[PDB]
Amino acid sequence: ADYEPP
Amino acid sequence: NNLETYEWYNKSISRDKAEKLLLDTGKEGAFMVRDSRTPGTYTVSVFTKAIISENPCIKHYHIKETNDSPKRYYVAEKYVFDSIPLLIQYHQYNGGGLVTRLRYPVCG
């Protein structure tokens, strides 16, 4: 949600 | 963690600088990594090099850690390794699922 979810 | 020593793990910078610098470096695979504040590991900031118009598609990921052996970090949902760098190597010398996978370590 706060980091480009792989 | 021998991560901050590689060619992509910065310090106290944050994906901001990574992107701010990665997005400015314009390198088809320019990536970095950093240990956020509430992260259980480290986050990688990658930057590729799109053809034209479309513009570069820089991106970053958080090397998710688990509880196995080795597979200690993963930037996807199956890519788990006990070597973010290796993982990086994996996300560059293998399939990969992130921005054209790792390629060039633009470590600020």
From Swiss-Prot, chain A:
Annotated localization: Cytoplasm
PTM text: Phosphorylated after T-cell receptor activation by ZAP70, ITK and TXK, which leads to the up-regulation of Th1 preferred cytokine IL-2. SYK-dependent phosphorylation is required for recruitment of PI3K signaling components.
Tissue expression per record: Highly expressed in spleen, thymus, and peripheral blood leukocytes.
Domain notes: The SH2 domain mediates interaction with SHB.
Function in brief: Adapter protein primarily involved in signaling pathways within T-cells, as well as other immune cells such as platelets, mast cells, and natural killer (NK) cells. Plays a crucial role for transducing signal from the T-cell receptor (TCR) after antigen recognition leading to T-cell activation. Mechanistically, once phosphorylated by the kinase ZAP70, mediates interactions with the guanine-nucleotide exchange factor VAV1, the adapter protein NCK and the kinase ITK.
Subunit and partners: Interacts with SLA. Interacts with CBLB. Interacts with GRB2. Interacts with SHB. Interacts with PRAM1. Interacts (via SH2 domain) with CD6 (via tyrosine phosphorylated C-terminus). Interacts with FYB1 and the phosphorylated form of FYB2. Interacts with 14-3-3 adapter/YWHAZ; this phosphorylation leads to YWHAZ proteolytic degradation. Interacts with VAV1; this interaction plays a role in TCR-mediated cytokine production. Interacts with AGER; this interaction plays an important role in AGER-mediated pro-inflammatory responses and cytokine release.
Name this protein carries in UniProt: Lymphocyte cytosolic protein 2
Lineage: Eukaryota, Metazoa, Chordata, Craniata, Vertebrata
Gene designation per UniProt: Lcp2
Curated annotation (Swiss-Prot), chain B:
Post-translational modification, as annotated: Ubiquitinated.
Disruption phenotype: Mice display decreased mature thymocytes and elicit profound defect in CD4+ and CD8+ T-cell development. Additionally, they show a strong decrease of cytokine production in response to TCR receptor stimulation. Impaired TCR-mediated calcium response in gamma-delta T-cells. Loss of Vgamma2-positive immature thymocyte-specific transcriptomic profile, although there is no change to overall transcription factor expression levels. Not required for the generation of IL17A expressing gamma-delta T-cells.
Induction: Through a myriad of surface receptors including the TCR/CD3 signaling complex, coreceptors, or chemokine receptors.
Occurrences of domain SH2 (ranges): 8-106
Tissues expressing the protein: Is detected in the thymus, lymph node and very faintly in the spleen, but is not detected in the liver, lung, kidney, heart, brain, intestine or testis. Expressed in T-lymphocytes and mast cells. It may also be expressed in natural killer cells.
Top-level taxon of origin: Eukaryota
Compartments it resides in: Cytoplasm; Nucleus
Record family assignment: Belongs to the protein kinase superfamily. Tyr protein kinase family. TEC subfamily.
Domains as described in the record: The N-terminal PH domain allows ITK to be recruited to the plasma membrane by an activated PI3 kinase. This domain also contains a proline-rich region (PRR). The adjoining domain is a SH3 domain, which binds to PRR (from itself or from other proteins). Next, a SH2 domain is required for binding tyrosine-phosphorylated substrates. In the C-terminal region, the kinase domain is required for tyrosine phosphorylation.
Quaternary structure, from the entry: Homooligomerizes; this association negatively regulates kinase activity. Interacts with PPIA/CYPA; this interaction regulates TCR signal strength via a proline-directed conformational switch in ITK. Interacts with THEMIS. Interacts with FASLG. Interacts with VAV1; this interaction is important for VAV1 localization and TCR-induced actin polarization. Interacts with TBX21.
Function as written in the Swiss-Prot or TrEMBL entry: Tyrosine kinase that plays an essential role in regulation of the adaptive immune response. Regulates the development, function and differentiation of conventional T-cells and nonconventional NKT-cells. When antigen presenting cells (APC) activate T-cell receptor (TCR), a series of phosphorylation lead to the recruitment of ITK to the cell membrane, in the vicinity of the stimulated TCR receptor, where it is phosphorylated by LCK. Phosphorylation leads to ITK autophosphorylation and full activation.
Official protein name in the record: Tyrosine-protein kinase ITK/TSK
